Design a protein around this ligand. Structure first.
Ligand SMILES: CC(=O)N[C@@H]1[C@@H](O)[C@H](O[C@@H]2O[C@H](CO)[C@@H](O[C@@H]3O[C@H](CO)[C@@H](O)[C@H](O)[C@H]3NC(C)=O)[C@H](O)[C@H]2NC(C)=O)[C@@H](CO)O[C@H]1O
Ligand SMILES: CC(=O)N[C@@H]1[C@@H](O)[C@H](O[C@@H]2O[C@H](CO)[C@@H](O[C@@H]3O[C@H](CO)[C@@H](O)[C@H](O)[C@H]3NC(C)=O)[C@H](O)[C@H]2NC(C)=O)[C@@H](CO)O[C@H]1O
Ligand SMILES: [Cl-]
Ligand code: NA
Ligand SMILES: [Zn+2]
Length: 285
């Protein structure tokens, strides 16, 4: 049969809209990747995005949006940019010359999903790793045979591979106190009170001690708007520097990694089987 119609929760308007898969995936790709990425990277992303929807259909309904399979918020499911949005933001020439490449990538992989033992997988993906992807359980909760840590040697060419942020000691404690009212921390000798308790081999900070509090790397990323939870802290006179690696949760497929592999000659099946361990590709329509 033809492309299914899905229920998408638009987090901005607050309404559930019906959309055709293909048209929806064009919007996902437009927001997740640049039209300037290699066709093989875009194709890999389109398969993951499609697989994400299929995976959610087969599993339990979400707490956030129970009437919708996926939503338009990259913080919950994946990014989305409608045709009108992109038209007003980029123009008619862009739609005809660049967006066309996105549509071609989506139709290029029509009905294709990533599978583990013939079922659709949870195809998590993110911008840039630190050099290795993360095992699902070390970042989230559960262990999956296909979300394992693998090398990602082209990530170092990403503009988002490294970043640093300086925060005064004062603002460091002020931000923590505003977010955690029970925190007992002193602006002097932060180096004696702040320390990383547990970190994965890939580098995601799982636990970090701040005074009397134990937070996760994600918690820190959130409070200070860092690109990732893979960071180290260096204490200076009057400030702290966060030295961050990568951008995004680090599990599954690296978008800049895929771009790097594609630039080196790899095709979308090999990109997808490299990041999603022991998987295959299946055409469901
Ligand atoms: C394409 C992509 O990677 N999108 C990202 C989202 O997947 C991600 O949402 C978070 O996803 C993980 C994995 O699905 C969720 O973890 C699950 O949490 C539940 C309950 O807490 C637990 O039962 C599951 O075992 C656990 N899954 C795993 C694999 O361990 C997590 O709850 C989602 N977070 C939120 C806030 O909804 C978001 C946010 O990280 O980013 C997208 O880019
Ligand atoms: C006309 C034109 O293309 N102008 C450029 C903009 O497209 C560009 O916007 C940014 O594009 C990138 C895609 O490479 C977006 O990155 C993605 O962001 C989402 C979260 O929204 C995240 O899930 C993805 O991991 C991430 N992808 C990658 C590969 O890192 C980024 O959000 C876009 N920002 C926007 C739309 O505000 C800007 C960026 O400066 O440059 C124009 O020249
Ligand atoms: Cl499709
Ligand atoms: Na197909
Ligand atoms: Zn969602």
């Amino acid at each position: 049969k033809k492309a299914p119609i899905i229920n998408v929760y638009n987090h901005i308007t607050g309404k559930t809209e019906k959309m055709d898969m293909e048209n929806y995936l064009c919007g996902v790709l437009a927001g997740e990747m640049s039209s300037e990425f290699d066709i093989e990277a875009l194709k890999a992303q389109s398969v993951a995005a499609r697989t994400y929807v299929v995976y959610k259909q087969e599993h339990g309904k979400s707490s956030k949006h129970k009437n919708a399979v996926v939503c338009t918020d990259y913080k919950h499911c994946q990014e989305y940019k409608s045709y009108d949005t992109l038209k007003k933001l980029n123009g008619e020439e862009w739609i005809k010359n660049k967006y066309s490449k996105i549509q071609e990538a989506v139709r290029g992989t029509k009905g294709q999903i990533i599978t583990y033992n013939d079922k659709a997988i949870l195809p998590l993906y993110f911008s840039t790793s630190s050099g290795k992807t993360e095992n699902s359980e070390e970042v989230f909760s559960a262990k999956y045979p296909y979300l394992k840590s693998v090398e990602s040697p082209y990530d170092k060419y990403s503009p988002k591979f490294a970043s640093t942020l300086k925060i005064s000691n004062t603002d460091f404690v002020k931000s923590l106190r505003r977010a955690y009212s029970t925190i007992v921390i002193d602006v002097n000798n932060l180096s004696k009170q702040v320390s990383i308790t547990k970190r994965s081999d890939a580098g995601t900070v799982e636990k970090i001690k701040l005074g009397n509090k134990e937070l996760t790397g994600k918690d820190i990323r959130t409070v200070f708007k860092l690109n990732s939870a893979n960071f180290d802290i260096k204490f200076g006179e009057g400030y702290i520097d966060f030295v961050v690696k990568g951008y995004g949760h680090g599990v599954g497929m690296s978008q800049w990694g895929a771009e790097g592999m594609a630039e080196e000659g790899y095709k979308y099946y090999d990109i997808l089987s490299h990041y999603y361990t022991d998987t295959k590709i299946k055409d469901i329509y």
